Structure 1
Amino acid sequence: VDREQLVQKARLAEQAERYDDMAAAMKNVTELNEPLSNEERNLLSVAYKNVVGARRSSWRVISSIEQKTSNEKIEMVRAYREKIEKELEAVCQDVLSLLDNYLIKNCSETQYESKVFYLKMKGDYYRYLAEVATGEKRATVVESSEKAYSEAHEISKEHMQPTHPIRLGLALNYSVFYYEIQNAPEQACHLAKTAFDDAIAELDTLNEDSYKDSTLIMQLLRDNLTLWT
């Protein structure tokens, strides 16, 4: 295949809700070992979010049956949870190695938006690993999630407008990280509130090509703040 054909396959796979196909095409595109265009970046993220998501869903269901069920069935439930878990971990590692070995690694200096987009993805996929991890393994992935979000945050503060959708979406997930993973509801509300306030303070920084995305995520920040407070 050529690159155009892989990307066309990803677009078709998306429409067909065949997300394993979509992710495999976008991984192949990444493995051509060149930067991704905005569209390629978005296709990659959409593909893997869908793959990790279903299971992020299946794991919650089987974990819940496990908690309600736990007679000894229990062996099965537990085995099946662990199978789903291992799939979910392998998906995350699949993305994290694309990020570490290609996308972050080779991102050019002036491509701040890409940098922040990939560091946020790195935070996200360590956070998905943290959702299922326990013990010392949890401590490690939690540290790695926060390190990735923190670096994304520093770059975005320096190089992007407070209204930029990628900066706003980062604040959204970083604050979810504080709320849900670290159970630090003050640190979560402060981050969300700050990101919202800073965007509001600068509506004049909305872009004619992205203002709908900016305002949508502003509302998402607000929705979380309201829930949490």
Structure 2
Amino acid sequence: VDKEELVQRAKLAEQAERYDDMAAAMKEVTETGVELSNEERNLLSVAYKNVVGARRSSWRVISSIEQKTERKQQMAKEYRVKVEKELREICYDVLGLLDKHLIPKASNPESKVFYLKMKGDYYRYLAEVATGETRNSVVEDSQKAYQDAFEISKAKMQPTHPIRLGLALNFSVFYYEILNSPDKACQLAKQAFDDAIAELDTLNEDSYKDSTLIMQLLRDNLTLWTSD
């Protein structure tokens, strides 16, 4: 009975440019314990993506300032540690929610591939800053989560589909940035591009319009990786 109220509050917080409140409402609406639809699932994805992206951009700028040179160095180290703490908190929050309430109850291959992709994504965000054994563990979790979603996508999910294309894009960028193995990233992006072009003709107008954006990002990343 409260689900519509929480989703309305989430939409209002999105419109008001305050992503934290919409993220909290999203958290409650999933913690209630019923199956989620595409609209609320995308609202969760965009809310958590926005907050984590703001934290990540702040961390990137902090690290860039820290790189240059005396107490500034340890001050920037402490600031980076604080931003790391916030990033780890939000990432572990979303992963814990995903393991406990979402993927287990997911019923449609489409839902399963989306939640597995989100899990692999946030493990990638953790790996982007994590070092050492924790980095190794989160890398393993990211690869496993991405691979399972890849399997279900190849098994059932439509090959022109925007979620399949986005999974290919994220898997490739993970391969390139984290695993430091650009060959696999280039191969995966090339095969995804080729399959999408193979089934490009039968696309509708709207499906063409959303798919082409991920296609263009795949092309740009392929060009960046291929170039010197």
Residue ranges of structure 1 left out of the alignment (5+ in a row) = none
TM-score, length-scaled by structure 1: 0.95
Matched, 1:215 2:212: yes
Q: Please give the per-residue CA displacement for 1:154-194, whole angstroms capped at 9, x wherever unaligned.
A: 00011112110000000000000000001111100100110
> Is the contact between residue 172 and residue 192 of structure 1 (CA under 8 Å) also seen in structure 2?
yes
Pair 1:89 & 2:88 matched: yes
- CA distance in 2 between partners of 1:100 and 1:21 (Å): 22
Alpha-carbon separation, structure 2, partners of 1:191 and 1:159: 18
Q: Which runs of 4+ in 1 moved over 4 A?
A: none
Distance 1:199 1:47, change over 3 A: same
Tell me the distance in 1 between the aligned counterparts of 2:163 and 2:114.
7
Answer yes or no: is 1:126 the counterpart of 2:117.
no
Matched residue, 1:11:
11
The 5 A counterparts of 1:196-211 are 196-207=193-204, 209-211=206-208
Contact 1:163 1:205 in 2 (8 A): no
Structure 2 residue 2 is the aligned partner of structure 1 residue 2? yes
Distance 1:205 1:123, change over 3 A: farther
User: Which range moved further: 203-212 or 167-176?
Assistant: 203-212
State TM-score, norm by structure 2.
0.96
Distance 1:30 1:210 in 2: 28
C-alpha distance in 1, partners of 2:224/2:72?
Answer: 37
Would you say the 8 A contact 1:92–1:129 is kept in 2? Answer: yes
Q: Kindly indicate whether residue 139 of structure 2 is the aligned counterpart of residue 142 of structure 1.
A: yes
Post-superposition offset of 1:217: 1.2
Q: Which whole-Å CA distance do the structure 2 matches of 1:91 and 1:225 have between them? A: 30
Contact 1:20 / 1:51 at 8 angstroms: preserved in 2? yes
In structure 1, give the amino acid aligned to 2:16: A
In structure 2, stretches of 5+ residues that fail to align are none
How far does the alpha carbon of each residue in 1:72-92 deviate from its partner, in whole angstroms, 9 at most, with x for none?
A: 332221111101001001111
Residue of structure 2 equivalent to 1:63? 63
Aligned to 1:195: 192
Deviation string 1:95-148 (CA, Å, 9 cap, x unpaired) is 10111001101112xx01111010000010000000000011110001100101
